[PDB]
Enzyme design. Structure first.
Site, PDB file in Angstrom:
ATOM      1  N   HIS A 201       0.819  -1.208   0.000  1.00  0.00           N
ATOM      2  CA  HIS A 201       0.000   0.000   0.000  1.00  0.00           C
ATOM      3  C   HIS A 201       0.859   1.266   0.000  1.00  0.00           C
ATOM      4  O   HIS A 201       1.456   1.624   1.020  1.00  0.00           O
ATOM      5  CB  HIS A 201      -1.057   0.022   1.113  1.00  0.00           C
ATOM      6  CG  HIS A 201      -2.029   1.157   0.962  1.00  0.00           C
ATOM      7  ND1 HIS A 201      -3.310   0.946   0.500  1.00  0.00           N
ATOM      8  CD2 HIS A 201      -1.858   2.481   1.185  1.00  0.00           C
ATOM      9  CE1 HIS A 201      -3.881   2.137   0.471  1.00  0.00           C
ATOM     10  NE2 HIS A 201      -3.042   3.091   0.870  1.00  0.00           N
ATOM     11  N   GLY A 202       0.894   1.925  -1.153  1.00  0.00           N
ATOM     12  CA  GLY A 202       1.615   3.173  -1.363  1.00  0.00           C
ATOM     13  C   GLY A 202       0.720   4.381  -1.180  1.00  0.00           C
ATOM     14  O   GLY A 202      -0.454   4.363  -1.576  1.00  0.00           O
ATOM     15  N   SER A 203       1.265   5.434  -0.560  1.00  0.00           N
ATOM     16  CA  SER A 203       0.542   6.675  -0.297  1.00  0.00           C
ATOM     17  C   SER A 203       1.496   7.849  -0.138  1.00  0.00           C
ATOM     18  O   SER A 203       2.692   7.650   0.110  1.00  0.00           O
ATOM     19  CB  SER A 203      -0.304   6.536   0.965  1.00  0.00           C
ATOM     20  OG  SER A 203      -1.245   7.593   1.059  1.00  0.00           O
ATOM     21  N   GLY A 210      -1.767  10.409   9.508  1.00  0.00           N
ATOM     22  CA  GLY A 210      -3.138   9.953   9.710  1.00  0.00           C
ATOM     23  C   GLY A 210      -3.307   8.449   9.592  1.00  0.00           C
ATOM     24  O   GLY A 210      -4.158   7.877  10.277  1.00  0.00           O
ATOM     25  N   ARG A 217      -8.333   4.042   6.231  1.00  0.00           N
ATOM     26  CA  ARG A 217      -9.773   4.298   6.308  1.00  0.00           C
ATOM     27  C   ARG A 217     -10.495   4.087   4.980  1.00  0.00           C
ATOM     28  O   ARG A 217      -9.909   4.293   3.912  1.00  0.00           O
ATOM     29  CB  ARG A 217     -10.046   5.731   6.812  1.00  0.00           C
ATOM     30  CG  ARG A 217      -9.587   6.025   8.232  1.00  0.00           C
ATOM     31  CD  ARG A 217     -10.668   5.783   9.254  1.00  0.00           C
ATOM     32  NE  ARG A 217     -10.528   6.731  10.351  1.00  0.00           N
ATOM     33  CZ  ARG A 217     -10.662   6.423  11.637  1.00  0.00           C
ATOM     34  NH1 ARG A 217     -10.982   5.185  12.004  1.00  0.00           N
ATOM     35  NH2 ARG A 217     -10.518   7.357  12.563  1.00  0.00           N
ATOM     36  N   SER A 243       2.034  -0.242  -6.341  1.00  0.00           N
ATOM     37  CA  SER A 243       1.824   0.537  -5.122  1.00  0.00           C
ATOM     38  C   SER A 243       2.743   1.746  -5.024  1.00  0.00           C
ATOM     39  O   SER A 243       2.293   2.796  -4.571  1.00  0.00           O
ATOM     40  CB  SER A 243       1.973  -0.346  -3.892  1.00  0.00           C
ATOM     41  OG  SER A 243       0.852  -1.202  -3.760  1.00  0.00           O
ATOM     42  N   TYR A 246       1.792   5.283  -6.218  1.00  0.00           N
ATOM     43  CA  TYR A 246       0.901   6.034  -5.338  1.00  0.00           C
ATOM     44  C   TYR A 246       1.644   6.823  -4.255  1.00  0.00           C
ATOM     45  O   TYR A 246       1.026   7.641  -3.567  1.00  0.00           O
ATOM     46  CB  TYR A 246      -0.172   5.106  -4.737  1.00  0.00           C
ATOM     47  CG  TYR A 246      -1.106   4.517  -5.772  1.00  0.00           C
ATOM     48  CD1 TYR A 246      -0.821   3.303  -6.386  1.00  0.00           C
ATOM     49  CD2 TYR A 246      -2.262   5.187  -6.159  1.00  0.00           C
ATOM     50  CE1 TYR A 246      -1.669   2.762  -7.350  1.00  0.00           C
ATOM     51  CE2 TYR A 246      -3.118   4.657  -7.123  1.00  0.00           C
ATOM     52  CZ  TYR A 246      -2.819   3.441  -7.714  1.00  0.00           C
ATOM     53  OH  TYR A 246      -3.657   2.903  -8.662  1.00  0.00           O
ATOM     54  N   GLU A 327      -5.055  -6.227  -8.147  1.00  0.00           N
ATOM     55  CA  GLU A 327      -5.356  -5.330  -7.046  1.00  0.00           C
ATOM     56  C   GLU A 327      -6.427  -5.955  -6.157  1.00  0.00           C
ATOM     57  O   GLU A 327      -7.401  -6.520  -6.651  1.00  0.00           O
ATOM     58  CB  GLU A 327      -5.644  -3.878  -7.460  1.00  0.00           C
ATOM     59  CG  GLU A 327      -6.802  -3.637  -8.409  1.00  0.00           C
ATOM     60  CD  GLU A 327      -6.989  -2.162  -8.714  1.00  0.00           C
ATOM     61  OE1 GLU A 327      -7.919  -1.552  -8.139  1.00  0.00           O
ATOM     62  OE2 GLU A 327      -6.197  -1.610  -9.513  1.00  0.00           O
TER      63      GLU A 327
HETATM   64  N1  LIG Z   1      -6.352   6.890   7.822  1.00  0.00           N
HETATM   65  C1  LIG Z   1      -5.859   7.498   6.740  1.00  0.00           C
HETATM   66  N2  LIG Z   1      -5.269   8.703   6.903  1.00  0.00           N
HETATM   67  C2  LIG Z   1      -4.765   9.326   5.829  1.00  0.00           C
HETATM   68  N3  LIG Z   1      -4.755   8.921   4.553  1.00  0.00           N
HETATM   69  C3  LIG Z   1      -5.345   7.725   4.420  1.00  0.00           C
HETATM   70  C4  LIG Z   1      -5.910   6.962   5.433  1.00  0.00           C
HETATM   71  N4  LIG Z   1      -6.431   5.781   4.924  1.00  0.00           N
HETATM   72  C5  LIG Z   1      -6.173   5.856   3.641  1.00  0.00           C
HETATM   73  N5  LIG Z   1      -5.519   7.001   3.265  1.00  0.00           N
HETATM   74  C6  LIG Z   1      -5.089   7.378   1.919  1.00  0.00           C
HETATM   75  O1  LIG Z   1      -6.152   8.059   1.278  1.00  0.00           O
HETATM   76  C7  LIG Z   1      -6.237   7.662  -0.103  1.00  0.00           C
HETATM   77  C8  LIG Z   1      -7.567   6.946  -0.406  1.00  0.00           C
HETATM   78  O2  LIG Z   1      -8.192   6.466   0.528  1.00  0.00           O
HETATM   79  N6  LIG Z   1      -8.017   6.857  -1.682  1.00  0.00           N
HETATM   80  C9  LIG Z   1      -7.395   7.379  -2.905  1.00  0.00           C
HETATM   81  C10 LIG Z   1      -7.061   6.225  -3.840  1.00  0.00           C
HETATM   82  N7  LIG Z   1      -8.269   5.435  -4.170  1.00  0.00           N
HETATM   83  C11 LIG Z   1      -7.942   4.294  -5.038  1.00  0.00           C
HETATM   84  C12 LIG Z   1      -6.864   3.334  -4.548  1.00  0.00           C
HETATM   85  O3  LIG Z   1      -6.765   3.019  -3.364  1.00  0.00           O
HETATM   86  N8  LIG Z   1      -6.045   2.875  -5.525  1.00  0.00           N
HETATM   87  C13 LIG Z   1      -5.030   1.881  -5.471  1.00  0.00           C
HETATM   88  C14 LIG Z   1      -5.089   0.780  -6.329  1.00  0.00           C
HETATM   89  C15 LIG Z   1      -4.090  -0.188  -6.279  1.00  0.00           C
HETATM   90  C16 LIG Z   1      -3.031  -0.075  -5.384  1.00  0.00           C
HETATM   91  C17 LIG Z   1      -2.980   1.029  -4.531  1.00  0.00           C
HETATM   92  C18 LIG Z   1      -3.962   1.999  -4.563  1.00  0.00           C
HETATM   93  C19 LIG Z   1      -3.667   3.058  -3.545  1.00  0.00           C
HETATM   94  N9  LIG Z   1      -2.424   2.569  -2.969  1.00  0.00           N
HETATM   95  C20 LIG Z   1      -1.989   1.410  -3.499  1.00  0.00           C
HETATM   96  O4  LIG Z   1      -0.971   0.813  -3.167  1.00  0.00           O
HETATM   97  C21 LIG Z   1      -8.970   4.994  -2.941  1.00  0.00           C
HETATM   98  C22 LIG Z   1      -9.266   6.171  -2.020  1.00  0.00           C
HETATM   99  C23 LIG Z   1      -5.000   6.792  -0.375  1.00  0.00           C
HETATM  100  O5  LIG Z   1      -3.919   7.537  -0.930  1.00  0.00           O
HETATM  101  C24 LIG Z   1      -4.713   6.207   1.009  1.00  0.00           C
HETATM  102  O6  LIG Z   1      -3.346   5.849   1.161  1.00  0.00           O
END
Ligand SMILES: Nc1ncnc2c1ncn2[C@@H]1O[C@H](C(=O)N2CCN(CC(=O)Nc3cccc4c3CNC4=O)CC2)[C@@H](O)[C@H]1O
Length: 350
Positions: A201-203, A210, A217, A243, A246, A327
């Site tokens: 999980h990349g972010s 958070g 979440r 990942s 992201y 995914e």
């Molecule tokens: N508790 C939290 N506090 C702050 N940010 C948070 C969080 N929980 C999730 N996030 C972050 O918010 C974002 C989020 O939910 N999103 C945006 C992205 N979207 C599609 C998605 O998840 N695509 C997707 C698809 C395939 C792989 C991966 C992703 C994202 N990361 C991966 O490795 C789904 C809704 C995401 O970038 C996540 O990392």
């Protein structure tokens, strides 16, 4: 002075980097003179989100130009934007609502990071890094460079780095064994449920404050479902390269953070094409978006009863699919248990 190791101290410095929070806002075209880091609150971001749902129904109800113009102003009053000479894009099209909802999502994450960094009880005796570490309610430990769990993680990074993602080169700096408070007791009803996998999980770095303090979440049911390829759930990958895209990194900022989580998949619903619904059929616990390339299943190992798909990328044999790589999506926060956190250096090939 601080009792934490240098990689953990530098990790806190990354998670609470005020300049990286500011950099992200300027990218989203927010006027910092009108909207500083200190003046933004959860009250006004949540109020801007309610205006987006009012924009959503206005389009559906085919409201007048005046109604649309009012809402665009209402929004840009709460969230000031700097476009310079450029006219502000009107909130009328579904993609405009999608863009601003994705911006508000990332901006709420910056607020949570700043509220934590500034807030709390001010004590002279304790070290600032030690106080900020406490705020995350997470136990962060450095994984030994030449340990077996480090080598498993490094092999998982090396083998699952795809050929289509030839833009960069991944390099592991540090591995952290993270333990979120109460996440284990919450995961427990799924802790033995079959098909548990160690997934990526990349972010964005800004989100990590958070993610550690609240856990991954699921999107609010108010937000538009259009942007979610497989609905409102938690997305993961079995390929590090998918990942890593992201993480939101560049030549300027080549350091990014990625997660490894124990995901209780259960009986997966195998899908070839996108479905924006977040409702599963009877007996299904997750979604597996079938990709053209999968890590070799013959190389699958079991680190602490959890499947580690560290095989080399091979053709899945899946005919006519939209996805290049697999995914995995879970629609319950309790199906996730964050086990590790990696600090990666992206060597952008030029
Ligand atoms: N508790 C939290 N506090 C702050 N940010 C948070 C969080 N929980 C999730 N996030 C972050 O918010 C974002 C989020 O939910 N999103 C945006 C992205 N979207 C599609 C998605 O998840 N695509 C997707 C698809 C395939 C792989 C991966 C992703 C994202 N990361 C991966 O490795 C789904 C809704 C995401 O970038 C996540 O990392």
């Amino acid at each position: 002075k601080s009792k934490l190791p240098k990689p953990v101290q530098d990790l806190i410095k990354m998670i609470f980097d005020v300049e990286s929070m500011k950099k992200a806002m300027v990218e989203y075209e927010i006027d910092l003179q009108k909207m500083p880091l200190g003046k933004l609150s959860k009250r006004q971001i949540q109020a801007a989100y309610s205006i987006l749902s009012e924009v959503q129904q206005a389009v559906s109800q085919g409201s007048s130009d005046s109604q649309i113009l009012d809402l665009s102003n209402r929004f840009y009053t709460l969230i000031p934007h700097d476009f310079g000479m450029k006219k502000p894009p009107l909130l009328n099209n579904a993609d405009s609502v999608q863009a601003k909802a994705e911006m508000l999502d990332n901006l709420l994450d910056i607020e949570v990071a700043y509220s934590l960094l500034r807030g709390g009880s001010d004590d002279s005796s304790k070290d600032p890094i030690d106080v900020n570490y406490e705020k995350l309610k997470t136990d962060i430990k450095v994984v030994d460079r030449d340990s077996e769990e480090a080598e498993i993680i490094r092999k998982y990074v090396k083998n699952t780095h795809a050929t289509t993602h030839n833009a960069y080169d991944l390099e592991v700096i540090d591995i952290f064994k993270i333990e979120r408070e109460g996440e284990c007791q919450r995961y427990k009803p799924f802790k033995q449920l079959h098909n548990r996998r160690l997934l990526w999980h990349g972010s964005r770095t800004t989100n990590f404050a958070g993610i550690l303090s609240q856990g991954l979440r699921i999107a609010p049911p108010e937000a538009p479902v259009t942007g979610y390829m497989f609905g409102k759930g938690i997305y993961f990958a079995d390929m590090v390269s998918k990942s890593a895209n992201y993480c939101h990194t560049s030549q300027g900022d080549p350091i990014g953070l990625i997660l490894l989580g124990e995901v209780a998949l259960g009986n997966m619903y195998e899908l070839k094409h996108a479905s924006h619904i977040s409702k599963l059929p009877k007996g299904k616990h997750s979604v597996k978006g079938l990709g053209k390339t999968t890590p070799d299943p013959s190389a699958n190992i079991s680190l602490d009863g959890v499947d580690v798909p560290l095989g080399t990328g091979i053709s899945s044999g899946v005919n006519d699919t939209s996805l290049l790589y697999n995914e995995y999506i879970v629609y319950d926060i309790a199906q996730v248990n964050l086990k590790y956190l990696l600090k990666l250096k992206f060597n952008f090939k030029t």
